[PDB]
Design a binder for this molecule. Structure first.
Ligand SMILES: [Mg+2]
Ligand SMILES: [Mg+2]
Ligand SMILES: [Mg+2]
Ligand SMILES: [Mg+2]
Ligand SMILES: [Mg+2]
Ligand SMILES: [Mg+2]
Ligand SMILES: [Mg+2]
Ligand SMILES: [Mg+2]
Ligand SMILES: [Mg+2]
Ligand SMILES: [Mg+2]
Ligand SMILES: [Mg+2]
Ligand SMILES: [Mg+2]
Ligand SMILES: [Mg+2]
Ligand SMILES: [Mg+2]
Ligand SMILES: [Mg+2]
Ligand SMILES: [Mg+2]
Ligand SMILES: [Mg+2]
Ligand SMILES: [Mg+2]
Ligand SMILES: [Mg+2]
Ligand SMILES: [Mg+2]
Ligand SMILES: [Mg+2]
Ligand SMILES: [Mg+2]
Ligand SMILES: [Mg+2]
Ligand SMILES: [Mg+2]
Ligand SMILES: [Mg+2]
Ligand SMILES: [Mg+2]
Ligand SMILES: [Mg+2]
Ligand SMILES: [Mg+2]
Ligand SMILES: [Mg+2]
Ligand SMILES: [Mg+2]
Lengths: 53, 158, 122, 86, 50, 135, 134, 59
RNA sequence: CGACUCUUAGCGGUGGAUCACUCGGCUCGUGCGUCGAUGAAGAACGCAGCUAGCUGCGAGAAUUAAUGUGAAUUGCAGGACACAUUGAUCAUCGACACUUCGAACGCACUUGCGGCCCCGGGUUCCUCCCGGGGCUACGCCUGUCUGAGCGUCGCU
RNA sequence: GGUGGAGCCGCCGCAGGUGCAGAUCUUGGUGGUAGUAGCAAAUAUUCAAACGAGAACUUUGAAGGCCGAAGUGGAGAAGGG
RNA sequence: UACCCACCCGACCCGUCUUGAAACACGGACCAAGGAGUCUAACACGUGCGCGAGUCGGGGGCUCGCACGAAAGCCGCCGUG
RNA sequence: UAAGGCUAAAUACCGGCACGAGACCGAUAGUCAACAAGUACCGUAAGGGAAAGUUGAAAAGAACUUUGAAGAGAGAGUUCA
RNA sequence: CGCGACCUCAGAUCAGACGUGGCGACCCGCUGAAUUUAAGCAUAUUAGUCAGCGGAGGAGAAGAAACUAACCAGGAUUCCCUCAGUAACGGCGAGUGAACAGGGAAGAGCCCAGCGCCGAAUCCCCGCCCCGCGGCGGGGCGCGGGACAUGUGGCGUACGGAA
């Protein structure tokens, strides 16, 4: 039971992990290349009105 | 059998660590068990500083630690006859009484008295009954607040 | 034709004992019939009758005890059957005077120094 | 002759049925059982082989007082009250 | 033994009744796993709880 | 004193462990007295004890016991704290005046073992790895 | 998604709570839908099936439009036993064949004191949810 | 008769008497290997078994 | 082509791997924290219309009354009932019950022996005898009654 | 290709109780041996009929035999149930 | 390439301990299935990534009935060390 | 400031009841125990202590003819099989 | 050669209570090895651990300092981090091996005896009523008992308290 199940990351490491994930949430290359079926989408960092909330 | 440069190591596992190992997969459910107390206690004592009673400015002891200051246990006795607060009343008014502190200096005495003087002034004594007489603070200074003090009452910053 | 607890509840004690003793007899014969072939028809009844004896005897001890716990209701010194059977620890818990009792010293403190209500910083 | 020829004259009994245990371990001579140990007021349970403990503990039997305790608690231990009639 | 006690007699009475087969009708019950008794004894092999 | 209860000398094993005459009970004799009086009157709940007299061969410990279930005790508070089921035989656990001295508690630079709850629950804490979740 | 912890979602645990549920519950389980006519008339989607209720098979080998009446209910085999729903055995002795409620549709409820009040109370709950959503 | 196993003869006698408004010369009990207590009850000479069989329904 | 044998193949078995399922485990969390002389835990024996086992129950024995629930129940019978009805069944359970051992309690454990109270028959307390009900185990607390003591006195 | 009857795989990652010929390794199964060893302590059987689908083996009769009252005779204990 | 067969040359039975095994050393009838370097702490070097005279991590706090959650996020905490 | 004494709270929980989940095991694994499991059986006794899951979707589980003393077959029948 | 108080001590199937077994992870007293480790070995260690034994509860123990400190001081308990694998112990070797300060969870404080004050201000058990009765309790009324003067109630308890 006392196997070291869980693990560890530096805050900074795992903040600029989010950066790199977000920065590539633009760039239709990478996003499409996950099979994310974005072809008829108007623009990629896709912003929407705040009516949606 | 050592080989070529390490430390010595007296790891202490000759006893029986195995039986008495505490793993901590409570940790997060405990976090929450706790949450619900902090939470519940506050909703129960509705208007009352959630953190707890008022607690004195106090200096850390041993020589290294000198320059720091703390929430102490409770305000001294000598401290109160001075602020004009009866020790058994203080305990009902959310004023923390240690009665076990040797007060040695006028510096840290008046420093710590000013906290009581401060407290009195920004304290809304919510009256015994609704139709109640003296010392309870007026229906204006009463309507204005339902305000629990989140965080430590009059926090002591160095 | 079931001898329901409807129709017994409000009846005289001595009457029930006759109807019990009617059934008891009748049961004894159904055991005989069991041994002497009998018939499927009879070999069911033997259950209905058994149970109907309960349906009866219940009502007897029900209505006895209902009655019996009405003498000593009010009297102090009453028997074990009727004394309230919660749990040993539980019947040796303190009385419900004997914790909400307070020493007079303490009452005197509860009067002079009760806990106000108050929020602060305002 | 300590085998076969002695697995022979084995007529007479040491052990018999205990009136507390149920087991076949009354020593007739000693008149102590030696599964529970009888005249001994207390059971001989024994921290000792946990195997032989878990063969007869609260659970294994019927629990015919007990099983209806935990019933009564669940719901709250009340008595002398009957659900509202029709 | 021919000199028994009652306690010993009440045993064997019980044990004796525990040998009978399985009622055939059991085997038609909706959800069986039961085909033959499987706790049967024979005086000669398996020698009681005594 | 106390005498290792073994057939003859026969304290089998190593020559440290190899004694029998000269060695002492952990508890005190007073606490044994309390033990045995509270163990007679199993109904009664032990309080505490004086000394009355001694001899070369015995000590005479006179012991204060209470009925938890004199109404003269349930009904008066202060006293009604023995009644409560926690205190069932205080003297067997070592909660008596005398009985506690053996456990070796207090505050300070000597009551360091027993700095958890008690002698045992000191080391329960010290001879454990706090192996955290998250390491 | 479910949410309420204090409910299960476990492949096994409610596979279990099946062929161990008491006859009490099996009623609710052994329910079939009502035909459009009744579903209109009454404002109730589905009902617990009952011994003498008239029923149309919808799925199965011998689906059809023939309104047979229910005969009995294995709540043990946990399956119903209908009228011309039957097969001939090797000896000619006709035996009915099992069908669920769930694979059947009610075409005429057999009404009662106790069954009416359900139909009221289900239809009242339906409309209270629609009036609450309104 | 098969009889309840805690029965004595003066109980079996004041039973059989009470019921088949009979009277009993002597009772004579054994315990069948099975635990069932038998008790075969001689009825006084004035009084017949072969009739009181048909009353109690046996035969 | 003779028979046996070996190899390989075509099929027949034997065995029970593999795979695929899974009302069981295992692990980890949360809530609560459930005994008893009013007589536990534990055992014995018995109990179903057809029942050996498990399970459920206790001479009211595959349960008791009640409240929901609300038509089944079922291997086969059999059934009431009136399914316009505590109304089948199930869950709940709160109404009543609790065979024998057991801390097991009158004394012992043979299953025998008693004591003391009551009520049937017997008697007509005449005593058994036969029937029925209640007590009778050890420790100790508060109280009561009866006492003991050349213990300490008092009055005679 | 056949049979089988319910689920499965490819890449990029992450995770293992991870790959058997061996340990007089563990469990279950199966051979050769082999249709092999063997069914040898108390001298003893034979005929006829019955019954039976089926008889050396059951039964009845007849005949030959043994135990041979310190018994293979007739009753019990403990044990057995 | 694989099955049988045919020929010509080659050719000792594996595993293991072993200076040396085909061993007149030991294990090993055959087959299925199971089966042996695992986890944790502590070091140490090597390397990967973050930040850099800092840097962290808890333990604590603040933000959940978790569906995902016993996660993630955030804290003069952030430094009491 | 001992020689007298009480006490919530955090704090512990492989036993109980009641639940929720999983990078889990998946019937020689997983607990001894998926089932009559602490069962069968062994030992006088302390104690020891197993094996054993799967028809199909539905028993629709071969009616009937026929061979066979009977076990078994051949047709036939049922079945998507 | 009486009767009567008390003191000690018996007997009661007396009136009313109660104790005893089990469960046993966690909880508390005690007791208590040897494998093992040290390349042996007895010192040491395993390890105050297992068995043994005793004892409790919904948690257990402890707890309002005969403490900490050496500061310019703090301030019941327990718990987590931390100190810190450190001060020391040891054929100073195998191992062993805590504490003080800080931060944080939580955080509540209190009661006796004595000195004295106060017509025992007390307490227990009966009887009659009034309410209350499925955790037996209030209210009253009774020359109905009894403890208690070798001492029962209130204030009071050291942070002062009494007057
Ligand atoms: Mg706080
Ligand atoms: Mg006081
Ligand atoms: Mg034999
Ligand atoms: Mg298998
Ligand atoms: Mg398999
Ligand atoms: Mg005298
Ligand atoms: Mg794995
Ligand atoms: Mg393998
Ligand atoms: Mg001869
Ligand atoms: Mg004979
Ligand atoms: Mg070598
Ligand atoms: Mg050679
Ligand atoms: Mg070798
Ligand atoms: Mg103290
Ligand atoms: Mg205490
Ligand atoms: Mg406590
Ligand atoms: Mg298997
Ligand atoms: Mg297995
Ligand atoms: Mg298979
Ligand atoms: Mg298989
Ligand atoms: Mg097929
Ligand atoms: Mg106990
Ligand atoms: Mg060595
Ligand atoms: Mg050594
Ligand atoms: Mg050695
Ligand atoms: Mg040593
Ligand atoms: Mg030591
Ligand atoms: Mg040590
Ligand atoms: Mg132990
Ligand atoms: Mg401290």
């Amino acid at each position: 039971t006392w196997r070291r199940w869980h693990r560890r990351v530096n805050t900074t490491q795992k903040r600029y992990a989010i950066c790199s994930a977000l920065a590539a949430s633009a760039l239709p290359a990478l996003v499409m290349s996950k099979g994310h079926r974005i072809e008829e989408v108007p623009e990629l960092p896709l912003v929407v009105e705040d009516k949606v909330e | 059998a050592p080989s070529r440069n390490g430390m010595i190591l007296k790891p202490h596992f000759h006893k029986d660590w195995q039986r008495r190992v505490a793993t901590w997969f409570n940790q997060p459910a405990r976090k929450i068990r706790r949450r619900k107390a902090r939470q519940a206690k506050a909703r129960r004592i509705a208007p009352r500083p959630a953190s707890g009673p008022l607690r004195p400015v106090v200096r850390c002891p041993t020589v290294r630690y000198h320059t720091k200051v703390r929430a102490g246990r409770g305000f001294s006795l000598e401290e109160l006859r001075v602020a004009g607060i009866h020790k058994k009343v203080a305990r009902t008014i959310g004023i923390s009484v240690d009665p076990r502190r040797r007060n040695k200096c006028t510096e840290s005495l008046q420093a710590n008295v000013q906290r009581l003087k401060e407290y009195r002034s920004k304290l809304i004594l919510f009256p015994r009954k609704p139709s109640a007489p003296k010392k309870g603070d007026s229906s204006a200074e009463e309507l204005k607040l339902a305000t629990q003090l989140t965080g430590p009452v009059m926090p002591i910053r160095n | 034709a079931k001898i329901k607890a409807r129709d017994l509840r409000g009846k005289k004690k001595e009457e029930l004992l006759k109807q019990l003793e009617d059934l008891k007899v009748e049961l004894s014969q159904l055991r005989v019939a069991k041994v002497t072939g009998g018939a499927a028809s009879k070999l069911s009844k033997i259950r209905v009758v058994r149970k109907s004896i309960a349906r009866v005897l219940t009502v007897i001890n029900q209505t006895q005890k209902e009655n019996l716990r009405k003498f000593y209701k009010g009297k102090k010194y009453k028997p074990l059957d009727l004394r309230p059977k919660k749990t040993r620890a539980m019947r040796r818990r303190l009385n419900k005077h004997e914790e909400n009792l307070k020493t007079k010293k303490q009452q005197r403190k509860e009067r002079l120094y009760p806990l106000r209500k108050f929020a602060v910083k305002a | 002759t300590k085998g076969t020829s002695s697995f022979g004259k084995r007529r007479n009994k040491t052990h018999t049925l205990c009136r507390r245990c149920g087991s076949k371990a009354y020593h007739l001579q000693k008149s102590t059982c030696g599964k529970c140990g009888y005249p001994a007021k207390r059971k001989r349970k024994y921290n000792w082989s946990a195997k032989a403990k878990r063969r007869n503990t609260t659970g294994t039997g019927r629990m015919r007082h007990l099983k209806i305790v935990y019933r009564r608690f669940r719901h709250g231990f009340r008595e002398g009250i009957t659900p509202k009639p029709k | 033994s021919s000199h028994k006690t009652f306690r010993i007699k009440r045993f064997l009475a019980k044990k004796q009744k525990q040998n009978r087969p399985i009622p055939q009708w059991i085997r038609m019950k909706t959800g069986n796993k039961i085909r033959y008794n499987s706790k049967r004894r024979h005086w000669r092999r398996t020698k009681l709880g005594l | 004193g106390r005498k290792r209860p073994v057939p003859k000398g026969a304290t089998y094993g190593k020559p440290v462990h190899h004694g029998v005459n000269q060695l002492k009970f952990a508890r005190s004799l007073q606490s044994v007295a309390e033990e045995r009086a509270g163990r007679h009157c199993g109904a009664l709940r032990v309080l505490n004890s004086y000394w009355v007299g001694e001899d070369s061969t015995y000590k005479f410990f006179e012991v204060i016991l209470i009925d938890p279930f004199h109404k003269a005790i349930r009904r008066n508070p202060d006293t009604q704290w023995i009644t409560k089921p926690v205190h069932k035989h205080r003297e067997m656990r070592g909660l008596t005046s005398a009985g506690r001295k053996s456990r070796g508690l207090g505050k300070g630079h000597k009551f360091h073992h027993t700095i958890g709850g008690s002698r045992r629950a000191a080391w329960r804490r010290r001879n454990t790895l706090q192996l955290h979740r998250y390491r | 998604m479910k949410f309420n912890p204090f409910v299960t979602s476990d492949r096994s645990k409610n596979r279990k709570r099946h062929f161990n549920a008491p006859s009490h519950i099996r009623r609710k389980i052994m329910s079939s839908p009502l035909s459009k006519e009744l579903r209109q008339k009454y404002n109730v989607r589905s009902m617990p099936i009952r011994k003498d209720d008239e029923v149309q098979v919808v799925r199965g080998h011998y689906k059809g439009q023939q309104i047979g009446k229910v005969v009995q209910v294995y709540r043990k085999k946990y399956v119903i036993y209908i009228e011309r729903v039957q097969r001939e055995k090797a000896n000619g002795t006709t035996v009915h064949v099992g069908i669920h409620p769930s694979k059947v549709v009610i075409t005429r409820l057999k009404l009662d004191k106790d069954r009416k009040k359900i139909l009221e109370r289900k239809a009242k709950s339906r409309q209270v949810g629609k009036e609450k959503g309104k | 008769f098969i009889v309840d196993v805690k029965a004595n003869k003066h109980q079996i006698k004041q039973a059989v008497k009470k019921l088949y408004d009979i009277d009993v010369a002597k009772v004579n009990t054994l315990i069948r290997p099975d635990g069932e207590k038998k008790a075969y009850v001689r009825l006084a000479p004035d009084y017949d078994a072969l009739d009181v069989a048909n009353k109690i329904g046996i035969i």
